[PDB]
Write an enzyme that holds these catalytic residues in place. Structure first.
Site, short mmCIF file in Angstrom:
data_model
loop_
_atom_site.label_atom_id
_atom_site.label_comp_id
_atom_site.label_asym_id
_atom_site.label_seq_id
_atom_site.Cartn_x
_atom_site.Cartn_y
_atom_site.Cartn_z
N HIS A 183 0.82 -1.22 0.00
CA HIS A 183 0.00 0.00 0.00
C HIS A 183 0.85 1.27 0.00
O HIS A 183 0.51 2.27 0.64
CB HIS A 183 -0.97 0.01 1.18
CG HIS A 183 -1.71 -1.27 1.38
ND1 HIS A 183 -2.49 -1.84 0.40
CD2 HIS A 183 -1.78 -2.11 2.44
CE1 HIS A 183 -3.01 -2.97 0.85
NE2 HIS A 183 -2.60 -3.15 2.09
N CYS A 184 1.98 1.23 -0.71
CA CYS A 184 2.86 2.39 -0.87
C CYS A 184 3.35 2.90 0.48
O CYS A 184 3.54 4.11 0.68
CB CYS A 184 2.17 3.50 -1.65
SG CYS A 184 1.83 3.11 -3.39
N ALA A 185 3.58 1.98 1.43
CA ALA A 185 4.05 2.35 2.77
C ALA A 185 4.96 1.24 3.30
O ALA A 185 4.65 0.54 4.26
CB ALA A 185 2.88 2.62 3.72
#
Lengths: 414, 414
Positions: free
Chosen positions: A362-364
Site C-alpha cells: 500500500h505504498c508504505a
C-alpha cells in the site's frame, strides 16, 4: 436528511455488474473511487459542447471553457475553505502537489542543520520527495514514532520537532492504519518551532470536511480520483504568502508574464504554478464531484463511513486467526492479514467471489516494516458501500480460512 | 480511401451547434482540438465499466484498468515507431515532458561552457525550461536565427551548434509560422557535435506521421489535447539509453522498487518516470484517439491539411491589407494581421460571425518581437475543417476590413 445508499448506488453505473458470476463488491476505494453519472456526464458535456483552450477570452467556446475551469477552482476553494483562489493550484494529483512543495519550498528553504520531520505511517508520496530534498540540501530527515496502536502522540511530535525543524509533513488520514492524525495540534506545534506543516490529505478529503483555515495547515494536497472525480487531477493548497515566495516547479506558456531571450517573469498566483495547457476537463469534473459530495453532505458521508468502519471492526473481531492493524477510531478502511495465508491469495480468492480489495504494501514500506509484516490486505469503504457488502467480505474471509486450512490438511494426509 | 469530411465531422458532436446565431466555424485546433465520439465514449466506458487503480494485478477491474493503460502505452509506441514501451512516458502534456528533459537531463549534463541551442520560433514551453536550466548550471543559451520567410537553414544550424553544444531543442512544427522544421537533418547535425536533440512535437504529432527512429530524435514531446485526445495527458519519448541514465523528476509511489527510511531505489523504465496514480482514463482515451487517427490515416490527414493550407493561403492573398507570416510550404494554419485592425478586434468580430480563432502572441513572444509585431491572429485547421469554412473566414475578414474602414470614415466626418 440522511443518506439513501440505494439512491446513491443508483448513480454509479460501474457498481451494477458481475465479476466471476458474482455481484461486484468494490471495497478498494482507498486505491481509487468510482464516479457517479454527474461527474461522467460533466466530462461528456465538456467534450460535446464547449471544449476549447482557456484564458484567451477570444471566442465563445473558449470563454465557456475558461469559465468552467476557473469556476471549478472556486468550487475547490469553497470546498476546503481556502481564503483565495490564488491558493488553489490544479496539479496532476497529490503526489505531484507534494513534489511541488518539495522542489519549490523545501529545496529553497533547507540548509545543513535544518530538519524535515515526517512519520512512519506516511505513504511514499509523502516520504521520497523529502528524502530527495534533504539529500539535495544536506538537511536531516527525522521520523515521529508511532504509538503501538498506530496513532501519534502529541509529545512524540513535540519531542521530534525542534527549533531546527523547518518542515513537518504528515498525512491527515493513513491509507493503511485508518488513523486520523491530529493535524491542527501538530500544525500549532510546528509553527511554535518555526516550521511549516504540509498535510497529505489524499485520504481525508474524499471522506470528511476539510477546513484549511481551522487546520491552519501551510500546505494541503489532495487527489480527485479518490473523491469521485476524474483521474489525473489533484490540488495543491498553500498559504498565499508562502506561494508568493516560492518559484515555479514547471516553466512554459500560461505561467509567464513577459518572456525575453534569456529571462522571464511569472504570472500572479495561482497561474504561476500552472504551466502549459491545464487539465481542463478533469478540473471541471472535479468541480462536479465536489458539487455531488456537497449535495450529499460530507458530514453524512463521514457518519456513514464511521458506521461501516465500526461494523467492519466488530465483524472482523468475530473471525478467528485474523489480525487488524491500527486503532479503533478510524476512517473507513481495514488493513488486515489472515493467519497463515498470504494476502495476495486472500485477494485472489475474494476476487473469485466478486470482492475487490488490495494486497501488497500500500505504498508504505517503512510502515509495513514497522508492523513487522511484508504485505497486508486492505478493504476500504466509501459512500456507496453497505453493511451487506461487509457481510459478504467477512463470510468470504471465513471461506478462505476454512479452504486454506482444508487444503493444508489434505496435503498433510499425503 | 480518401477522407470523407462529412462522415468525419459527423463523429464530432461539438461541431454541430450555433454561436451568436451562426453555425460554429472552429478554426482554433492549434490551440486545442475537438474530440470524436470514439474518444469520449472510451472515457465513458472506462468510468462506467472498469475504473480501478493500475499495476496491482489483484482484482478483475484492476486488471482491466492496467491492461487498458499499458495497452495505450503500446498504442503510443507503435504510433510514433518507438523501439520500446520503456521509451514511452505518460505525462501531463508537452510542457511537462519538456520540463522533465530540462530537470532530469539538462541540469545533470550542463557545465559552464556548455550550450543549449534553440530557435527564435519556439513556443514558451520549449524556451523557459532551457532558460532555467542554463541559469541553474551556468551554461549558455543560444538561438538559431530564422530566415526571412520564417524557416531555418541548415547552415545557420551548423554555425550555431558547436562542439560545446550539449542540447539542441527545436519544434517539429511551429504553431505560429506553420513551418515544418528539418528535424532529421538537425538531429544529425546535433549528433555530429556531441549534442542530443529534443523535439517539441506538440503541433506535428496530430497532423503528420511521426517516426522517431527515422527522425533519430533523442527526445520527443507531444500533447493529447491537440490530437483529438483528452486534456491533461501527453507523452515524453526518450531514447532508452538516455532515460536509463536520467534520474526521476518526481518521486512517490508506483515509481519505486524499495523504500527505506532515507534511501530508495526506482522501478525500471518507463515507470521510473510515472510517480503516483497515473492519468488512467486520459491515457486510455489518448490510445483511442490514436486508433481513430490511424483508422483515418495520418497521411490522409496531412494531405487534407495541405489542401486546406494551400487554399487558405491563396484566398488570403486575395484580401487587400492582410499580412500572412511564414513560408508557403506549411502545416495547416495561417497566422496573420489585418492592416490597421488589432487582431483582438478581428477575433471578436469573427466570433460574432461564429468563427473561432486566436488573437495574441501564441506563447511565442520572442518570435512576435522577431516579426516586429505585438500580436497576431491565427486560424488553424484539422481533419474536420473544410474549404467552405475557410471561405466563411475570408469573407468575414473582408467584412471586418470594410466595417472598420467605414467606422474610421464615419469618425473622420465628425
Amino acid at each position: 436528511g440522511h443518506m439513501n445508499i440505494t439512491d446513491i448506488r443508483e448513480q454509479f453505473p460501474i457498481l451494477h455488474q458481475q465479476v466471476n458470476g458474482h455481484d461486484l463488491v468494490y471495497l478498494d476505494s482507498a486505491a481509487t473511487s468510482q464516479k457517479p453519472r454527474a461527474v461522467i456526464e460533466t466530462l461528456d458535456k465538456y467534450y460535446n459542447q464547449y471544449n476549447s483552450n482557456v484564458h484567451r477570452g477570444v471566442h465563445t467556446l473558449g470563454t465557456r471553457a475558461t469559465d468552467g475551469y476557473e469556476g471549478a477552482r472556486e468550487k475547490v476553494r469553497k470546498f476546503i475553505n481556502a481564503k483565495s483562489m490564488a491558493e488553489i493550484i490544479f496539479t496532476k494529483g497529490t503526489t505531484t502537489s507534494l513534489n511541488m512543495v518539495a522542489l519549490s519550498y523545501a529545496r529553497a528553504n533547507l540548509k545543513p542543520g535544518d530538519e524535515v520531520v515526517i512519520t512512519y505511517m506516511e505513504a511514499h508520496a509523502n516520504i521520497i520527495p523529502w528524502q530527495q530534498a534533504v539529500k539535495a540540501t544536506g538537511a536531516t530527515l527525522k521520523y515521529i514514532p508511532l504509538q503501538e496502536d498506530g496513532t501519534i502522540s502529541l509529545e512524540d511530535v513535540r519531542e521530534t520537532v525542534t527549533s531546527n525543524t523547518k518542515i513537518v509533513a504528515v498525512s491527515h488520514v493513513s491509507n493503511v492504519l485508518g488513523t486520523v492524525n491530529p493535524i491542527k495540534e501538530m500544525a500549532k506545534i510546528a509553527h511554535d518551532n518555526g516550521a511549516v506543516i504540509v498535510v497529505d490529505g489524499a485520504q481525508s478529503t474524499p471522506h470528511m470536511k476539510i477546513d484549511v483555515q481551522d487546520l491552519d495547515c501551510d500546505f494541503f494536497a489532495l487527489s480527485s480520483h479518490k473523491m469521485c472525480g476524474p483521474t489525473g487531477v489533484g490540488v495543491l493548497y498553500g498559504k498565499k504568502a508562502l506561494l508568493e515566495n516560492m518559484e515555479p516547479a514547471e516553466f512554459g506558456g500560461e505561467m509567464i508574464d513577459f518572456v525575453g531571450l534569456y529571462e522571464s517573469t511569472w504570472k500572479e498566483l495561482p497561474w504561476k504554478f500552472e504551466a502549459g495547457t491545464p487539465i481542463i476537463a478533469g478540473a471541471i469534473g472535479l468541480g462536479a464531484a465536489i458539487d455531488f459530495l456537497e449535495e450529499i453532505g460530507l458530514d453524512e458521508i463521514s457518519r456513514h463511513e464511521h458506521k461501516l468502519a465500526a461494523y467492519a471492526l466488530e465483524r472482523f473481531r468475530q473471525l478467528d486467526g485474523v489480525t487488524v492493524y491500527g486503532p479503533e477510531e478510524r476512517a473507513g478502511l481495514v488493513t488486515f492479514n489472515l493467519d497463515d495465508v498470504h494476502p495476495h491469495d486472500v485477494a485472489t480468492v475474494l476476487d473469485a467471489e466478486g470482492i475487490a480489495v488490495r494486497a501488497g504494501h500500500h505504498c508504505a514500506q517503512p510502515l509495513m516494516k514497522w508492523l513487522d509484516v511484508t504485505a497486508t490486505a486492505r478493504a476500504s469503504f466509501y459512500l456507496y458501500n453497505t453493511e451487506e457488502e461487509i457481510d459478504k467480505l467477512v463470510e468470504a474471509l471465513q471461506k478462505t480460512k476454512e479452504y486454506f486450512t482444508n487444503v493444508f490438511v489434505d496435503l498433510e494426509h499425503h
